[PDB]
Amino acid sequence: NKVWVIGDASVDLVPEKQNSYLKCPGGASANVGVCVARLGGECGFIGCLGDDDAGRFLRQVFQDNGVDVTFLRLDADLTSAVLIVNFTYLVHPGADTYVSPQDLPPFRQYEWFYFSSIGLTDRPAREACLEGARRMREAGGYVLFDVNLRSKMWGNTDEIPELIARSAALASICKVSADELCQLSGASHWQDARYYLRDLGCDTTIISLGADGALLITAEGEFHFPAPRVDVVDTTGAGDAFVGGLLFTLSRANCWDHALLAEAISNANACGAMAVTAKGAMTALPFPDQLNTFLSS
Amino acid sequence: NKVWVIGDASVDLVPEKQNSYLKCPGGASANVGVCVARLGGECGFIGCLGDDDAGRFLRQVFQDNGVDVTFLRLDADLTSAVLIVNSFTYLVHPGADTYVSPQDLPPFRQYEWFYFSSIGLTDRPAREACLEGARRMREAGGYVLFDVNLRSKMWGNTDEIPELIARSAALASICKVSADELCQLSGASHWQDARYYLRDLGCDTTIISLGADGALLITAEGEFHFPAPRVDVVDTTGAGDAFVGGLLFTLSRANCWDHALLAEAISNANACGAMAVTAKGAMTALPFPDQLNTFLS
Ligand SMILES: Nc1ncnc2c1ncn2[C@@H]1O[C@H](COP(=O)(O)OP(=O)(O)CP(=O)(O)O)[C@@H](O)[C@H]1O
Numbered sequence: 001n002k003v004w005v006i007g008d009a010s011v012d013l014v015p016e017k018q019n020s021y022l023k024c025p026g027g028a029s030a031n032v033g034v035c036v037a038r039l040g041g042e043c044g045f046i047g048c049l050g051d052d053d054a055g056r057f058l059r060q061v062f063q064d065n066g067v068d069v070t071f072l073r074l075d076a077d078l079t080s081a082v083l084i085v086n087f088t089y090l091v092h093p094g095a096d097t098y099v100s101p102q103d104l105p106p107f108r109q110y111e112w113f114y115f116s117s118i119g120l121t122d123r124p125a126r127e128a129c130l131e132g133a134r135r136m137r138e139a140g141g142y143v144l145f146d147v148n149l150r151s152k153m154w155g156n157t158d159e160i161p162e163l164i165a166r167s168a169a170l171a172s173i174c175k176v177s178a179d180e181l182c183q184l185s186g187a188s189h190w191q192d193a194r195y196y197l198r199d200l201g202c203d204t205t206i207i208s209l210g211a212d213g214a215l216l217i218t219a220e221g222e223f224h225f226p227a228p229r230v231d232v233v234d235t236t237g238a239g240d241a242f243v244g245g246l247l248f249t250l251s252r253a254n255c256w257d258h259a260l261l262a263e264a265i266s267n268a269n270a271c272g273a274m275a276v277t278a279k280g281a282m283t284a285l286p287f288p289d290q291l292n293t294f295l296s297s
Numbered sequence: 298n299k300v301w302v303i304g305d306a307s308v309d310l311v312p313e314k315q316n317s318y319l320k321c322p323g324g325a326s327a328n329v330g331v332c333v334a335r336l337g338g339e340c341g342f343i344g345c346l347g348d349d350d351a352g353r354f355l356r357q358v359f360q361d362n363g364v365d366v367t368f369l370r371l372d373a374d375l376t377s378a379v380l381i382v383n384s385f386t387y388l389v390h391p392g393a394d395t396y397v398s399p400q401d402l403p404p405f406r407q408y409e410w411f412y413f414s415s416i417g418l419t420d421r422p423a424r425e426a427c428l429e430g431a432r433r434m435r436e437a438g439g440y441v442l443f444d445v446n447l448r449s450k451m452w453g454n455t456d457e458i459p460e461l462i463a464r465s466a467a468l469a470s471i472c473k474v475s476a477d478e479l480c481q482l483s484g485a486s487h488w489q490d491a492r493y494y495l496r497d498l499g500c501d502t503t504i505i506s507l508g509a510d511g512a513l514l515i516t517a518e519g520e521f522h523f524p525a526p527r528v529d530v531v532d533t534t535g536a537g538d539a540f541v542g543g544l545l546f547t548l549s550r551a552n553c554w555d556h557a558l559l560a561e562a563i564s565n566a567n568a569c570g571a572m573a574v575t576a577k578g579a580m581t582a583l584p585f586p587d588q589l590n591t592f593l594s
């Protein structure tokens with residue numbers, strides 16, 4: 001089953017010499033997408049980018065990695081996001097924010113649709129996301145909502161709670177980090193908010209706990225899934241890598257049951273880790289071979 | 298005599314490999330300024346930048362090159378212009394340079410030179426800085442060199458361009474324009490059919506730059522042509538600005554100008570125009586005095 005990823009793709013510029021910048025592939029939706037593909041899963045990216053040098057570069061990365069870019073509309077009246085890292089935002093109306101409902105493909109039953117709160121920041125992309133999730137549900141598809149909070153990017157932070165809630169309603173599964181549970185709920189202890197979304201309408205919650213692995217909150221109870229122990233070298237991209245692994249596994253069958261869900265979180269942690277022993281985000285994502293060599297240690 | 302340059306200072310990102318960007322000081326006003334300074338002339342930059350990375354960085358380049366930055370202010374609320382050369386992707390929406398205002402203008406003295414392009418006329422504040430700037434310099438007995446450096450894309454509604462160009466040429470002691478801009482300016486397939494466009498707008502001295510050809514001088518005494526040196530193109534980015542820098546350096550060596558000085562200025566302008574096209578980056582190959590001579594010959 002195909003895995004649709006909708007959202008942001010941007011170019012991060014990192015120093016190389018006293019007079020150069022290395023252009024790295026970035027974006028939460030982008031990493032997740034490359035992740036699923038780089039694991040042999042069928043993944044399509046739904047989004048928007050500028051026809052500038054950056055957007056073309058990005059589109060190439062998707063292709064080098066096996067990500068279907070048929071619904072990645074490259075426009076010329078738009079500007080692809082470029083960031084200076086030290087971190088910095090040069091382009092603000094942002095091109096990935098213009099992706100709209102008419103940028104969405106037809107969905108098929110058992111397909112998965114992904115999106116984070118990041119794509120809910122600016123109005124156009126907001127409809128693509130909410131309409132996107134509604135359509136996939138209507139088609140007998142699954143929605144995985146990853147609250148990937150970045151308040152800073154939000155104009156009126158008063159919209160956050162509302163969108164998150166309306167998202168948990170459409171979603172089949174919600175992924176959230178312990179820190180986010182505290183931000184949204186206000187509690188100091190995340191476990192005091194482990195039912196935040198469950199009350200907001202999502203019968204299956206996956207709480208990433210950093211090195212402590214994951215916590216599954218379903219109707220019957222909560223099950224802890226510890227993570228492999230490793231040499232923390234850089235936690236960047238970890239969460240996105242985690243979701244990619246989860247989506248890759250879930251897409252391996254029409255219905256997901258007990259065993260599949262438990263297997264997905266295991267895979268999610270594996271990816272999350274390898275995406276921490278290395279450096280970078282997209283360049284930490286493993287290939288089926290590396291995952292095993294790492295898994296069996 | 299001091300040469301004042303008012304306008305844009307930016308970071309030009311020049312694509313090296315299909316994975317890197319070359320970081321170079323950019324901006325038309327910036328290049329011209331660094332050009333005059335390198336040649337040993339007294340040049341001050343009048344402008345605005347963000348207390349940001351590109352801003353502090355850029356300020357540093359002006360200092361390494363001998364450009365007086367006493368009237369260049371860095372505002373934290375602003376964002377220094379960053380762009381990508383291809384032909385120009387404008388990352389930063391408005392852009393700090395847009396905020397120069399008449400108050401930022403410095404007291405002018407007699408025989409000094411004031412420079413500005415249509416680029417500084419694009420947005421609201423800076424527009425006044427330029428037009429009042431040129432008016433004050435004239436009132437002080439100084440000279441104004443207007444370089445129509447057309448970049449239509451960066452504008453609101455291009456209906457303002459003809460009007461501003463006309464008001465500028467009125468204030469100009471000398472107008473510099475490229476064959477190409479003339480057409481774009483006054484509908485035409487061939488520039489010659491419009492080489493009196495500005496002259497009919499109030500500028501009795503016009504210098505039309507002609508790519509690798511050199512330039513054509515136009516004063517009542519008649520029309521004259523100057524041949525540009527035989528050089529190998531690597532990057533044209535900056536030719537025009539290097540051209541004006543050389544012109545301003547020569548004109549500022551005297552209190553009055555005429556054919557002798559003027560004819561010498563254009564010769565120097567071509568020399569610089571040639572050299573600058575021999576390296577990636579707008580101000581990379583901007584020559585020092587020693588170098589200007591070994592090339593002259
Ligand atoms: N120190 C560590 N050792 C092993 N695995 C780790 C790890 N730190 C993180 N991980 C893996 O990365 C996963 C996701 O990272 P984490 O739990 O820190 O959320 P996050 O903050 O990266 C996502 P967000 O950006 O949305 O807040 C963890 O659940 C775990 O699988």
Ligand SMILES: Nc1ncnc2c1ncn2[C@@H]1O[C@H](COP(=O)(O)OP(=O)(O)CP(=O)(O)O)[C@@H](O)[C@H]1O
Binds near residue numbers: 507511533
């Ligand atoms: N190919 C070439 N070989 C040698 N010199 C060249 C050259 N191209 C340009 N030059 C030099 O630079 C000068 C200006 O070139 P050109 O007119 O193309 O710049 P430009 O069109 O960018 C001006 P503007 O900034 O107003 O648009 C030429 O007159 C010449 O002196």
Ligand SMILES: Nc1cncn1[C@@H]1O[C@H](CO)[C@@H](O)[C@H]1O
Binds near residue numbers: 308385448534535
């Ligand atoms: N600042 C600017 C806006 N659009 C283009 N530019 C500048 O034009 C100069 C060449 O004349 C380049 O250095 C570029 O930064």
Ligand SMILES: [K+]
Binds near residue numbers: 168169201203
């Ligand atoms: K739901």
Ligand SMILES: [K+]
Binds near residue numbers: 233236237275280284
């Ligand atoms: K990492």
Ligand SMILES: [K+]
Binds near residue numbers: 466467468469470499
């Ligand atoms: K005039």
Ligand SMILES: [K+]
Binds near residue numbers: 533534536573577
């Ligand atoms: K150049």
Ligand SMILES: [Mg+2]
Binds near residue numbers: 177179
């Ligand atoms: Mg985090």
Ligand SMILES: [Mg+2]
Binds near residue numbers: 537
């Ligand atoms: Mg030009």
